[PDB]
mmCIF file of C-alpha atoms in Angstrom:
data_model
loop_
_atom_site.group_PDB
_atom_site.id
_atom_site.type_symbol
_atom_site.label_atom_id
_atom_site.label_comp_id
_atom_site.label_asym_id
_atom_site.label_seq_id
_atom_site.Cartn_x
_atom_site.Cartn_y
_atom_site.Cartn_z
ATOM 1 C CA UNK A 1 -1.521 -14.008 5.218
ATOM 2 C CA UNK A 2 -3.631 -11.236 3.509
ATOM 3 C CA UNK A 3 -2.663 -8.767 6.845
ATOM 4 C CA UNK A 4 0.103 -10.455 9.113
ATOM 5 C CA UNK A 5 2.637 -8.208 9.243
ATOM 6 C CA UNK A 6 5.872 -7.874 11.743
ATOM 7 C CA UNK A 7 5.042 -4.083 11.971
ATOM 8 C CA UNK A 8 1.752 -5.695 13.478
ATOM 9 C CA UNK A 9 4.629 -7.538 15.622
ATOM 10 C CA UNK A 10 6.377 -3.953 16.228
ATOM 11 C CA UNK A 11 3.296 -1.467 16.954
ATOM 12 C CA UNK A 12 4.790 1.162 15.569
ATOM 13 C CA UNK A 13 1.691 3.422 14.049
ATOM 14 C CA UNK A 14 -1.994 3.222 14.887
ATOM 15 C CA UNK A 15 -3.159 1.944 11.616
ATOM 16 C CA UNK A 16 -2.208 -0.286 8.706
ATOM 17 C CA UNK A 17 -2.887 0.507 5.405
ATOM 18 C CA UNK A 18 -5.958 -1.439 4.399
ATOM 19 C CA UNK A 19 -6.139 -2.591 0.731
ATOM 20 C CA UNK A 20 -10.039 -2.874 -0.782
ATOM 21 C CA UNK A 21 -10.170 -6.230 -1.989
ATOM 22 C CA UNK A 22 -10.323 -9.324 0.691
ATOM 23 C CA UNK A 23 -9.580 -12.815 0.595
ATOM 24 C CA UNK A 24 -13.525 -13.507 1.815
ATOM 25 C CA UNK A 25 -14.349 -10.871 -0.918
ATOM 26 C CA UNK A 26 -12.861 -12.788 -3.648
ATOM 27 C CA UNK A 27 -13.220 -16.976 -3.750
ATOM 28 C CA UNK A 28 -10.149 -16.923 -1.574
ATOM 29 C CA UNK A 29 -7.113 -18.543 -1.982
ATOM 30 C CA UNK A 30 -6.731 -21.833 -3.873
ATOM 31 C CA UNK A 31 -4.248 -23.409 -1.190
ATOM 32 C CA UNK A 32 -4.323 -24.115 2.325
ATOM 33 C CA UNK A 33 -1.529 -23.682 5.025
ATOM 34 C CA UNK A 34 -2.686 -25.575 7.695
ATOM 35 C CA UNK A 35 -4.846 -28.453 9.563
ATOM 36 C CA UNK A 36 -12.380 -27.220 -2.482
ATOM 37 C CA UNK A 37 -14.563 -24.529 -4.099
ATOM 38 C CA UNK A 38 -13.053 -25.420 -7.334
ATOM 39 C CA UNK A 39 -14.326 -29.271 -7.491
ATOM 40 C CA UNK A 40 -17.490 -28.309 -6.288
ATOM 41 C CA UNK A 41 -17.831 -26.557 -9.659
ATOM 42 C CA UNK A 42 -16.437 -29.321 -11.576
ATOM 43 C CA UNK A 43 -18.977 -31.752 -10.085
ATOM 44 C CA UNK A 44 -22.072 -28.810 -10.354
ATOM 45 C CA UNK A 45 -21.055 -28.586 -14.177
ATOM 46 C CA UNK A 46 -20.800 -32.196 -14.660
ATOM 47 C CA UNK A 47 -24.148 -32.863 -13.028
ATOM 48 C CA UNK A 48 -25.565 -30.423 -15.674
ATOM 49 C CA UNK A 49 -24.534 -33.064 -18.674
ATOM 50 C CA UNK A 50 -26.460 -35.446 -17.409
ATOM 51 C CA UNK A 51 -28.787 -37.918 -19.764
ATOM 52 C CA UNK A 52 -31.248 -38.013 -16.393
ATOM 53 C CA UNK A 53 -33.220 -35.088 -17.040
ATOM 54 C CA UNK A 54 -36.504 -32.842 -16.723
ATOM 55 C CA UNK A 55 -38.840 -35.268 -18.431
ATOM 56 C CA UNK A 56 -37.505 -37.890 -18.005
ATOM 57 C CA UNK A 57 -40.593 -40.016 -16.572
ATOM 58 C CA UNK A 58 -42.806 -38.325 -19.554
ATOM 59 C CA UNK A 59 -40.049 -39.978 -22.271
ATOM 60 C CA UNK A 60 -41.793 -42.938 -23.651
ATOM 61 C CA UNK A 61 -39.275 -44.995 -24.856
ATOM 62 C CA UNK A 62 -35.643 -44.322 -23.093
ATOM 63 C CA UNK A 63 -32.821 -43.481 -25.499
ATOM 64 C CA UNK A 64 -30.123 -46.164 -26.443
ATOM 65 C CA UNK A 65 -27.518 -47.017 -23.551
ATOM 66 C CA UNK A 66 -24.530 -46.945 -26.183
ATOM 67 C CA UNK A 67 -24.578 -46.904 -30.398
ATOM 68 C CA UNK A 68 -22.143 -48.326 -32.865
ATOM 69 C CA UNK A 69 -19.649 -46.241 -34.535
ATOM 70 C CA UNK A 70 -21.099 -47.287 -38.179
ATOM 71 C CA UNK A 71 -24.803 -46.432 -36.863
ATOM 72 C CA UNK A 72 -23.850 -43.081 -35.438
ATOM 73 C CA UNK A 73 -21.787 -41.986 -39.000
ATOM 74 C CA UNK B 1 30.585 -27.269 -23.443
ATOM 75 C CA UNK B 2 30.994 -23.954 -24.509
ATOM 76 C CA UNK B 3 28.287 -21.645 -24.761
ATOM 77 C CA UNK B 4 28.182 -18.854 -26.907
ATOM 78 C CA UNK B 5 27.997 -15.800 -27.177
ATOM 79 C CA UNK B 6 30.231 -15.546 -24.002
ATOM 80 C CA UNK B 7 28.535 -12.395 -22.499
ATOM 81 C CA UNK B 8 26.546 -13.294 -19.723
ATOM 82 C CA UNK B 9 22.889 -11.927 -19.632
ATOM 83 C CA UNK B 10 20.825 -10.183 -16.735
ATOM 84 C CA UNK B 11 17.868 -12.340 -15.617
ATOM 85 C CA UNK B 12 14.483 -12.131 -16.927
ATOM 86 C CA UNK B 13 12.601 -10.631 -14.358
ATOM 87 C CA UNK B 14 13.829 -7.155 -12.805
ATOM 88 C CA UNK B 15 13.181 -7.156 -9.093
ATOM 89 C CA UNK B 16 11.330 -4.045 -8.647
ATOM 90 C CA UNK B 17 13.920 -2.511 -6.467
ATOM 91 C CA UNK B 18 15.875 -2.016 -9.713
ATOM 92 C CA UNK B 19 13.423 -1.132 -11.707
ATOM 93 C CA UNK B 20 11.902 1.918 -9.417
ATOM 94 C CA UNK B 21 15.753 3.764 -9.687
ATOM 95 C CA UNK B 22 14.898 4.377 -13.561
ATOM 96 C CA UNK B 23 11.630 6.677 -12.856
ATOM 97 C CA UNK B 24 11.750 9.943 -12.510
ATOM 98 C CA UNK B 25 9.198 12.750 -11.906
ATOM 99 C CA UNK B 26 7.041 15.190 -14.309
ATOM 100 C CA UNK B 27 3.958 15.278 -12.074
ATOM 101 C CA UNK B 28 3.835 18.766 -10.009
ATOM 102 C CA UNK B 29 3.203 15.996 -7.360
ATOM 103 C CA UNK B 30 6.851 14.739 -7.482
ATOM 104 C CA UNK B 31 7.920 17.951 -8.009
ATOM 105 C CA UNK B 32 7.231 19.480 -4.895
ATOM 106 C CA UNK B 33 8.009 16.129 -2.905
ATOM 107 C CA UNK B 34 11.337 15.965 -4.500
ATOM 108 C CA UNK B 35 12.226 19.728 -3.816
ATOM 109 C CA UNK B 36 11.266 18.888 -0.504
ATOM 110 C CA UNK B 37 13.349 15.643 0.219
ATOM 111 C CA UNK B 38 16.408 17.436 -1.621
ATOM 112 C CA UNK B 39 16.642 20.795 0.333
ATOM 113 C CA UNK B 40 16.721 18.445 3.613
ATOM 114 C CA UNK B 41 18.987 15.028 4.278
ATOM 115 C CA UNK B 42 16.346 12.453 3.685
ATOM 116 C CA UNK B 43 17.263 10.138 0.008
ATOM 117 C CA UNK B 44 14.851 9.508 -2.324
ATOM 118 C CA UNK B 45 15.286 5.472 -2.509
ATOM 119 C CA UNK B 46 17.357 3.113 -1.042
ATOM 120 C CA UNK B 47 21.130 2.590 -0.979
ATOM 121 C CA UNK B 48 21.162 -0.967 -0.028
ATOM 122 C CA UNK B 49 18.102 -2.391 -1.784
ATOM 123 C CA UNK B 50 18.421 -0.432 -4.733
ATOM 124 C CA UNK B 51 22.171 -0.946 -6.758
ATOM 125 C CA UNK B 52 23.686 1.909 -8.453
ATOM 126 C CA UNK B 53 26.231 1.674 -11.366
ATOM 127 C CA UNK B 54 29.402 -0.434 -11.132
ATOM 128 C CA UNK B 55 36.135 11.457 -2.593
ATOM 129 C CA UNK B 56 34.999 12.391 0.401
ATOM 130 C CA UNK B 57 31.224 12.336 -0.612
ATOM 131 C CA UNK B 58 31.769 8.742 -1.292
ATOM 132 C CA UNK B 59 33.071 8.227 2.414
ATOM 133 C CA UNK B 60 30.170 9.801 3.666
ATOM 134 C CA UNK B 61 27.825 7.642 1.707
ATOM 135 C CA UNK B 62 29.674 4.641 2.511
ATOM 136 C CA UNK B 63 29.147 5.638 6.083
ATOM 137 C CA UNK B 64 25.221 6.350 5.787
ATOM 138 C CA UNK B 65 24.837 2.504 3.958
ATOM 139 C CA UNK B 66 26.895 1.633 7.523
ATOM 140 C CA UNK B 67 24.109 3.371 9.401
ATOM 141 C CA UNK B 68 21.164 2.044 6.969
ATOM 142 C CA UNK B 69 22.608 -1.302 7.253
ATOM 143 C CA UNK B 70 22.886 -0.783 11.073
ATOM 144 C CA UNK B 71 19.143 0.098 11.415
ATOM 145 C CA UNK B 72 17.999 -3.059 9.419
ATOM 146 C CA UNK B 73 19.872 -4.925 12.195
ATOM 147 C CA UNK B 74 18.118 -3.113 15.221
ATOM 148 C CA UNK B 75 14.752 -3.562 13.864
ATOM 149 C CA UNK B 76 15.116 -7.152 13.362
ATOM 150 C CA UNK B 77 16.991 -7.575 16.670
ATOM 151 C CA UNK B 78 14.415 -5.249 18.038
ATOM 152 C CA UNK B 79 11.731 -7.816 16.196
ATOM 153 C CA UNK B 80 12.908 -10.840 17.235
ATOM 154 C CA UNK B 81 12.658 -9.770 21.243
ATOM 155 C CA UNK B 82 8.455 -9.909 20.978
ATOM 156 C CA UNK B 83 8.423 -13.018 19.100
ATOM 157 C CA UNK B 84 9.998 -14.710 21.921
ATOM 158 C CA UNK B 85 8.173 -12.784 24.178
ATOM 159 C CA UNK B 86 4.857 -14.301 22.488
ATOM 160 C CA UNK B 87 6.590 -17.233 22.407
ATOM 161 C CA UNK B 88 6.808 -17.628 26.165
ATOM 162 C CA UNK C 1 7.277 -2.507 1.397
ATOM 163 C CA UNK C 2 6.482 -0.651 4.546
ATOM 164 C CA UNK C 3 5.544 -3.137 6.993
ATOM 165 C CA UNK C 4 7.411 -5.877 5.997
ATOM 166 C CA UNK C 5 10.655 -4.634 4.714
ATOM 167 C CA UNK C 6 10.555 -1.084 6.163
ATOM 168 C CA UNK C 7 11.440 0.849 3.190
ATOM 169 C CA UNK C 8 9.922 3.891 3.097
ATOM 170 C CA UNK C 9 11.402 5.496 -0.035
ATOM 171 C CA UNK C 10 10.532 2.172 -2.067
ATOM 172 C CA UNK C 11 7.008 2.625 -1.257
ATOM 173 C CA UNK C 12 6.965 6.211 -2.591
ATOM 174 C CA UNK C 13 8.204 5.463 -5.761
ATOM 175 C CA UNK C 14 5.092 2.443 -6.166
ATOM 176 C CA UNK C 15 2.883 5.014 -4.758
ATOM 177 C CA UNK C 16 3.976 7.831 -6.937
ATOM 178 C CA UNK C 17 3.887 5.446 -10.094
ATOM 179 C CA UNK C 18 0.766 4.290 -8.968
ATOM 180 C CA UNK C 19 -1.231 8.105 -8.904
ATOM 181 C CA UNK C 20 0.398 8.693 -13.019
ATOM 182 C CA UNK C 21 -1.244 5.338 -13.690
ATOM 183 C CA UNK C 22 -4.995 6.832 -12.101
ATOM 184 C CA UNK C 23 -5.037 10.095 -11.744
ATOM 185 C CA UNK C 24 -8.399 10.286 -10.745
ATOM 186 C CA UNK C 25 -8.827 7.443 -7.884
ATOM 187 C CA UNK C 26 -9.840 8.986 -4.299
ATOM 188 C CA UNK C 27 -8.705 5.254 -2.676
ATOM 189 C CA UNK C 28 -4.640 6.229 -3.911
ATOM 190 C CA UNK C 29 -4.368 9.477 -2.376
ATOM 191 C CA UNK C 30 -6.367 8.505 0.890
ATOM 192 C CA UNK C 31 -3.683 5.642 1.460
ATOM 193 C CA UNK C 32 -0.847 7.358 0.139
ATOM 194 C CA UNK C 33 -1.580 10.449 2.532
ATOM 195 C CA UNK C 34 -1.744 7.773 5.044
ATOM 196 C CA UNK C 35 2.074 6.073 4.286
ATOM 197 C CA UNK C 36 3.623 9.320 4.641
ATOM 198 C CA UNK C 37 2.055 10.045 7.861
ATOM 199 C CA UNK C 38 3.387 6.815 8.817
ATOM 200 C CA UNK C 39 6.514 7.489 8.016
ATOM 201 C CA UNK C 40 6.553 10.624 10.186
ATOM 202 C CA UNK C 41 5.599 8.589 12.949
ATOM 203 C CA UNK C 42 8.780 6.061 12.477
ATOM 204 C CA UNK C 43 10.967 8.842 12.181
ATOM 205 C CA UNK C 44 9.919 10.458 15.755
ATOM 206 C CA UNK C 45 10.437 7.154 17.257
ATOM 207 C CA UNK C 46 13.891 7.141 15.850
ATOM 208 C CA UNK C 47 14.994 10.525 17.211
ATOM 209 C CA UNK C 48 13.789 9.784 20.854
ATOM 210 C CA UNK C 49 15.461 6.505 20.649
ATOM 211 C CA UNK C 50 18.690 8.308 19.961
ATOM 212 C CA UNK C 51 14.912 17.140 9.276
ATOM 213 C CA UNK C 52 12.346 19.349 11.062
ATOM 214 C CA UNK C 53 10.149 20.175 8.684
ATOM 215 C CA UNK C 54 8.988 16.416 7.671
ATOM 216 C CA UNK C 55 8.931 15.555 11.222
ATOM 217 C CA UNK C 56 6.183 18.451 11.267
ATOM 218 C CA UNK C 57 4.224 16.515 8.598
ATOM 219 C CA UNK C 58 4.821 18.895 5.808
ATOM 220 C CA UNK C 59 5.700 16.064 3.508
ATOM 221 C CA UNK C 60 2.197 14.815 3.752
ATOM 222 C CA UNK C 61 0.431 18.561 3.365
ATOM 223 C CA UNK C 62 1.696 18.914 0.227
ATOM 224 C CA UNK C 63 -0.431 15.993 -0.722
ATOM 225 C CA UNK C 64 -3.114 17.188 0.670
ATOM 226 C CA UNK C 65 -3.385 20.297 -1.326
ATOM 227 C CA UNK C 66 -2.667 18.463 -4.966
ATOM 228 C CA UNK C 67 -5.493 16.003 -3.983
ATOM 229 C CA UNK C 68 -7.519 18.237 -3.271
ATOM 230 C CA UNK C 69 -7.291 20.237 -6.728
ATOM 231 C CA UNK C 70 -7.562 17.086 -8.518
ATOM 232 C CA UNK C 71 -10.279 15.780 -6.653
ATOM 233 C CA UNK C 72 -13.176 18.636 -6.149
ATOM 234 C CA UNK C 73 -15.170 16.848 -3.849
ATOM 235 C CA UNK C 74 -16.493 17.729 -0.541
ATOM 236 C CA UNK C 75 -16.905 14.027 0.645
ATOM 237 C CA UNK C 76 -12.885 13.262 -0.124
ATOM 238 C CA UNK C 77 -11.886 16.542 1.629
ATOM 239 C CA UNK C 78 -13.770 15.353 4.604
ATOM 240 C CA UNK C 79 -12.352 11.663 4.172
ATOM 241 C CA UNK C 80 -8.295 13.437 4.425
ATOM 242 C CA UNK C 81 -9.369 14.639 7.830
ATOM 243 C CA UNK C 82 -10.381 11.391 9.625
ATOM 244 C CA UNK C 83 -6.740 9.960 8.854
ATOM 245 C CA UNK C 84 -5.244 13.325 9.842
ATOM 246 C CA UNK C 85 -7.236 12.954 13.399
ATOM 247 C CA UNK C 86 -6.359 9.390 13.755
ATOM 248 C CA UNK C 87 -2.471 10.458 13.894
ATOM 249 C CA UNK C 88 -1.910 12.482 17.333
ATOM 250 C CA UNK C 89 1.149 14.369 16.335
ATOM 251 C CA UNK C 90 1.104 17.364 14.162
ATOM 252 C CA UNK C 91 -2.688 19.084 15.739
ATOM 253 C CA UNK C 92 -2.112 22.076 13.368
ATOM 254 C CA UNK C 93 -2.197 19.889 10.495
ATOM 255 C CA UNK C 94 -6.004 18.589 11.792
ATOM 256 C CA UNK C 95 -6.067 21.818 12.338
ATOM 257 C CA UNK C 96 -5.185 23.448 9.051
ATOM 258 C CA UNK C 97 -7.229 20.891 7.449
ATOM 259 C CA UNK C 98 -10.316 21.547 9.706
ATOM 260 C CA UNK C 99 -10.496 25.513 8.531
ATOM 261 C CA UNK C 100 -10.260 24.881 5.510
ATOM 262 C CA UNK C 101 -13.090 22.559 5.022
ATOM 263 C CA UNK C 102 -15.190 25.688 5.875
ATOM 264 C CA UNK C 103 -14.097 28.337 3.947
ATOM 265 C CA UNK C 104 -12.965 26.397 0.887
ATOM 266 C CA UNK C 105 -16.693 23.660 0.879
ATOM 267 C CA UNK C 106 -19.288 26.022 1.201
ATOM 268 C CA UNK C 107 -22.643 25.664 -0.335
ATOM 269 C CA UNK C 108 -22.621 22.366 0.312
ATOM 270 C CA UNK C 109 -24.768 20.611 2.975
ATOM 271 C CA UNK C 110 -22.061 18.049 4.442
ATOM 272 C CA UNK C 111 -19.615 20.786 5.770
ATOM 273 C CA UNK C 112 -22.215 21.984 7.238
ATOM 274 C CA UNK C 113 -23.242 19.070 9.118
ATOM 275 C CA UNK C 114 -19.659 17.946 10.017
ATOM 276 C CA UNK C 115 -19.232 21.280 11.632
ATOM 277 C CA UNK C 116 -22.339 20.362 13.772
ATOM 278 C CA UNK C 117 -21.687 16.625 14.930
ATOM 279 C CA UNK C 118 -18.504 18.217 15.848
ATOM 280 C CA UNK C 119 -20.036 20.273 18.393
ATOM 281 C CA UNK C 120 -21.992 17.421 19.990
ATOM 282 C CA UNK C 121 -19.003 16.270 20.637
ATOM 283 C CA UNK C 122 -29.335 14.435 36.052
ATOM 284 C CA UNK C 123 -27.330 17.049 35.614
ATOM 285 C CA UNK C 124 -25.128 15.424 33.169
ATOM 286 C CA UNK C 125 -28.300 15.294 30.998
#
């Protein structure tokens, strides 16, 4: 995809012309074309909102499980 | 339904090909490859990929498009030789 | 463009764009050097299938000297020649590229060195 040409087909010079940046250099692509990164992020920054924290065992008394409206205002 | 105004209008999105005919050079770069390419045969861009505007000059320019055109073909029948080749 | 749908004189025109854009970046004249010694190559093909002075590879040796005015560097100089040796055709070009890296780089310890390695290159021992 990133080098498949048919001149590659059709050896008609020695060399290609070779861009800098890779696929493997960047993430890659987002899309697959035959027989995830993303999602692992999503679940990594979810897991950092979490109410189970550092301390957790030296909290005395646990915070509430879930609040009224008219008690949090 | 009628749509107006009636003029018809060119698409958003120029396809390169059309857009490189519009540049032209300053650079002592382009300079010297243009003087180059000039004094001998070769065109600067392309007669089928790149439209112009809608006697005997024109005849022979019709007949190097002919030619172009013709080349186009033997690469890809040239091209399509290997693939079955790889195929088998 | 070039490998996919062969144009050659497409390409120039994105490369030529592309220098005007940065003027100063080594990695745009190395690979532009490079297409037009490609396209020499594709056009001797073509005549022993079936003008003179491209097929020589004068088209790319006048990029060679305008890169090399912009660019006063011995290390790029240097970096021209190992494309120009990777293409067989056209010696004198290597060539022409090869004496001037001495005369034109001096004082500098890399042409030095190049010109050395160079030469390196029972009783075979």
């Amino acid at each position: 995809f990133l080098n498949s040409t048919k001149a590659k087909l059709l050896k008609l010079t020695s060399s290609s012309i070779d861009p800098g940046l890779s696929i493997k250099q960047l993430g890659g692509l987002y899309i697959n074309f035959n027989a995830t990164q993303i999602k692992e992020k999503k679940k990594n920054e979810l897991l950092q909102k979490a109410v189970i924290t550092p301390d957790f065992e030296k909290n005395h008394c646990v915070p509430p499980y879930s609040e009224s409206k008219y008690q949090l205002q | 339904q009628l749509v107006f105004p009636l003029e018809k209008e060119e698409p958003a999105i120029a396809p390169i090909e059309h857009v490189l005919s519009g540049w032209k050079a300053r650079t002592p770069l382009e300079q010297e490859i243009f003087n180059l390419l000039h004094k001998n045969k070769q065109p600067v861009t392309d007669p089928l990929l790149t439209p112009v505007e809608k006697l005997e000059e024109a005849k022979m320019r019709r007949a190097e498009l002919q030619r172009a055109r013709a080349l186009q073909s033997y690469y890809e029948a040239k091209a399509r030789r290997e693939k079955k080749i790889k195929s088998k | 463009e070039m490998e996919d749908r062969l144009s050659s004189e497409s390409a120039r025109q994105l490369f030529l764009r592309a220098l005007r854009f940065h003027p100063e970046c080594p990695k745009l004249y190395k690979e532009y050097f490079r297409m037009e010694l490609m396209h020499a190559e594709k056009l001797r093909k073509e005549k022993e299938e079936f003008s003179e002075e491209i097929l020589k590879g004068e088209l790319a040796w006048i990029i060679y000297k305008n890169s090399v005015s912009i660019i006063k560097g011995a290390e790029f100089h240097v970096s021209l020649l190992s494309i120009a040796q990777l293409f067989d055709f056209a010696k004198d070009l290597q060539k022409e590229i090869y004496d001037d890296l001495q005369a034109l780089h001096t004082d500098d310890p890399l042409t030095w060195d190049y010109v050395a390695r160079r030469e390196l290159e029972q009783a075979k021992a």
